[PDB]
C-alpha cells in the first residue's frame with residue numbers, strides 16, 4: 471500500500487500516492503490534474519470524483535464509471551492506468567481517483583477559433599465516429615458530446631471523455647425532453663463539432679434555450695408536417711419558425727469539401743429516425759482515405775444489468791470498492 475500525501479489545489483484536497491508528483495490543475499463530474507508518475511515515467515491525468523457517494527445518483531455513477539473503464543479498451547477511449555483511494559477500509563471509503571495518460575489538450579485548445587484544413591477534420595471526426603461506433607455497440611451513449619469532452623494529443627490522437635455517465639451541441643430532441651432517444655443524439659453533436667472545425671465558428675451558439683432552438687430550426691432542413699405532429703402550443707411557435715423561407719444549407723460552408731458538406735446534412739437532421747449512425751458515417755465517401763472495417767471494432771458484450779437495480783448509497787459504494795480493490799493496472 472503506497473504512502474499518500476495531502477495538498478490543497480483550487481480549494482479541494484487531493485490525497486494521492488507519492489508516486490504522483492507535480493499536480494497541476496487542468497480543469498464535469500470531477501476536477502482533473504496533470505501529473506508525473508515516478509513509477510512508470512508517464513505524464514498522467516488524475517481525476518478526482520466530486521462527492522462520489524453523497525447521493526444515490528452519484529454512487530451509481532461512480533460505479534458506472536469504474537465498470538465502463540474496466541470494460542472498454544479502445545484507441546479513442548481513455549485507458550485506466552490506476553484507480554485509488556486514501557481509504558484504508560470500506561467504512562473509510564469516501565473519495566475516488568482515476569488515472570489515465572495525459573493527453574494535454576481538449577478540442578477547444580486545438581481549435582482556437584480558426585478553420586482547420588480538410589484533412590485535419592477528416593482525421594478528427596473519423597476518430598470521434600470510430601470511438602462512438604465502439605461505444606454505441608455496447609448500448610452506451612455519450613449524451614453530452616462536445617469539444618471539451620474530447621482530449622487530443624500533439625499527434626492529434628483523440629479520446630472521448632466521460633461517455634456513458636449522463637447546450638450548443640445538444641440534440642434538439644433532448645432539449646425538447648423527448649423520452650425515446652436513440653444513439654444518433656451523439657451524431658447530432660458530431661455535426662455541430664464538425665461544422666465548427668470547418669468554419670472556425672460555433673454553429674449554434676445560443677445564449678439561451680429559445681435562441682438555441684431558433685438558430686437550429688431556421689437553418690436546418692424543416693421536417694414534414696408528420697414530425698411536427700409527433701409534438702402543446704409549442705407546435706405553433708415551432709411551426710412558425712420552420713415554415714419560414716430558408717437559406718441553402720451548403721452555403722454556410724462555402725469552400726468546404728463537398729463530401730464534408732454532404733455528411734453534415736446527413737448528421738444535422740432533426741428527425742432522429744433519419745440521422746446517419748456512427749457506422750454509416752464511417753462508410754461515407756468523406757472518410758475514404760481513413761475507413762478500414764478490419765480496424766473499427768465493436769465492444770465486448772458489457773453487463774449493464776446494474777442499471778436496472780435500485781440500491782442505497784452504501785450498496786453502490788461497496789460494489790465500487792470491490793472494483794477498486796480488484797483493479798489490475800495494464801502491463802504496458
Ligand SMILES: O=C(NCCN1CCOCC1)c1ccc2c(c1)C(=O)c1ccc(Nc3cc(NC(=O)c4cccs4)c(F)cc3F)cc1CC2
Nearest residue numbers: 496515516517535548568570572573574575576631632633
Ligand atoms: O495538459 C493540459 N493542460 C492545460 C493547461 N495546462 C495547465 C498547467 O500549465 C500548462 C497548461 C490539459 C488540458 C486539457 C485536457 C487535458 C490536459 C487532459 O489530458 C485531460 C485528460 C483526462 C481527462 N479526463 C479524465 C476522464 C476519465 N474518465 C473518462 O473519460 C470516462 C469515464 C467513463 C467513461 S469514459 C478519467 F478516468 C480520467 C481523466 F483524467 C480530462 C482532460 C481534460 C483535457
